Design goal:
The structure is cut from a larger assembly and holds 2 copies of chain A.
Chain A (H helix, E strand, L loop, with lengths): L1 H16 L6 H18 L5 H18 L4 H22 L5 H6 L9 H17 L1 H6 L11 E5 L3 H10 L6 E5 L7 H10 L3 E5 L4 H5 L4 E4 L3 E2 L5 E4 L2 H10 L4 E4 L44 E4 L6 E4 L2 E3 L4 H8 L8
Parallel strand pairs in A: 1-2, 1-4, 2-3, 4-7, 7-9
Antiparallel strand pairs in A: 5-6, 6-8, 9-10
Helix pairs in contact in A: 2-4, 2-6, 3-4, 4-6
Chain lengths: 333, 333
Amino acid sequence: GSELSERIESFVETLKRGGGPRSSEEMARETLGLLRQIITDHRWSNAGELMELIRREGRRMTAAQPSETTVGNMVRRVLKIIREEYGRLHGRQESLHKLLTSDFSFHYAQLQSNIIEAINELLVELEGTMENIAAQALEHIHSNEVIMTIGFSRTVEAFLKEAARKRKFHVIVAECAPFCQGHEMAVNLSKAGIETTVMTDAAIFAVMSRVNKVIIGTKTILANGALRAVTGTHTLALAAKHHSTPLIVCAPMFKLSPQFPNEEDSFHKFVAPEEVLPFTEGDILEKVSVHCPVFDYVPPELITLFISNIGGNAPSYIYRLMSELYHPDDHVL
Amino acid sequence: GSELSERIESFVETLKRGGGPRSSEEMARETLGLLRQIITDHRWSNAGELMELIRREGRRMTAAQPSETTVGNMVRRVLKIIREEYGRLHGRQESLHKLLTSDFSFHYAQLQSNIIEAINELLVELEGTMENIAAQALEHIHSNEVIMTIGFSRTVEAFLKEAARKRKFHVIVAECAPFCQGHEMAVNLSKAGIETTVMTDAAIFAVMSRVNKVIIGTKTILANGALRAVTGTHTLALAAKHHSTPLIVCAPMFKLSPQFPNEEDSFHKFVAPEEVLPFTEGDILEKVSVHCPVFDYVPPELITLFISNIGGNAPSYIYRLMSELYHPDDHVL
């Protein structure tokens, strides 16, 4: 009750004010733990009340920070898990087959235990996601290869550190200005023994002619295979497409969102202009419009491969993955 | 003269029966020497008769072997030299300026010495073409580059040997089947300490993703910037264009032919089917049509740069060079 309410309020305020969990996996774990706490603590008779309350909590969580899709992704995953559990315990996708062939009020005592067990299994699968993704590094990196990365991605870092145990290759890291987080990635990879280069975004095209493949992370994967990545990733994808350089996205399955690129102006995250133009400029700040978008939209035609904890896939298959994770009625939430 | 006639017939028969000067520079030199001998020995009262006889032997030379454009190029160069000498001695290109603003057969008794001097100057300029092309190797090759070649080109071999004195790089040579002359090129490049790889044509598109730039020779440069090259160069150029890999053609100026790619079915050189399918196959040779084209047509849009003894040019400028070498009335010959 009070503990649950204060935990929810703290989570919402942390999302609204930023900071909190740097790791996306940590954010997913905290979201799942909070959802489990709501399921255990909150009182509900039938599954319909659970749907309504989880939907309200997820709506509040995503309204706190719409650019943080992992929270909504986990909320929809929990809703799908609850729906599947109810269908298994009570009963026995839209398609041409279903179209040709063709009630949550009922109550069950053991449904809650099954829901918690499924959520715990999901958490266990989430725990080993990074190792599962990194275990595929040797199948995609050959000897004396050149890899291009932008910003700081922990999944890509684990990928490269696992590949470096048996192969020698070069990694080029482009800083993601203004938050030049690529410097930390470069120094980490150098500490791991990999030979690394640090450069600004302005050189992304210039050196792309000498890059064998591009390995990047993302914040979100849309239903059509599009990316909500850090800013400057669209230019990197365009430069890779110019040279037909394969672009690999190493992203866990919990970053898949059933949304579509129809949404406008809430996609990119806009922050204080101080990052781009300092406050000490003076009077010219009065008449100059300064905008600092954090995220970028990447169309699916610029992506070659998705590597996740379940293996490799093409963007054209992303829809099927989206069909296996979320019910079509939970996209609106 | 009888000796001149026997030399002309020897040249014509050598062209018809194949072989002869292995290097294109040697055959250009031989053509220029033969033209000089014809000019000296034959009796001509005025410039028009000299033009007519030059055109007659040029027609015979070109009809001996149409696929060898160097002979016709030298004949047309001599004709343009005669035109410019007669115009400078006697008097003072179709353009809008000439159109808005708007004859031979007048004997002068001083044109022959000028013609011979210009021919000798052309010969001296022809002697040092390969060194002039090779001197620009360092401006186009950087450290630890990957270069790709097809067949055996002496100009490209000189290019790479000159570049290898100061930089270290890798060279991949694709054998030009059936006449696998790329083996000779790879062995020669390995003799100079360059790390080299031998592979077949079928692997070209397989390795273009790891190639930085493609440096090739050619047999002929057409008026629009197209190429007559060894068979397999068109697919190599298409593969380079797929990856936006810069394709450099190292070809001297005497390989520029003022004809257009309108001509068909005589562009390629069809040789005996023994090179592709051996005679020992037996009865199946009765009902199998096997063709062995020696040359390939490369459209101008697949060529990035032309490196010649006068420097680097784009294909879009080739027309101007044509207008600087040949008179438009000598294109038909």
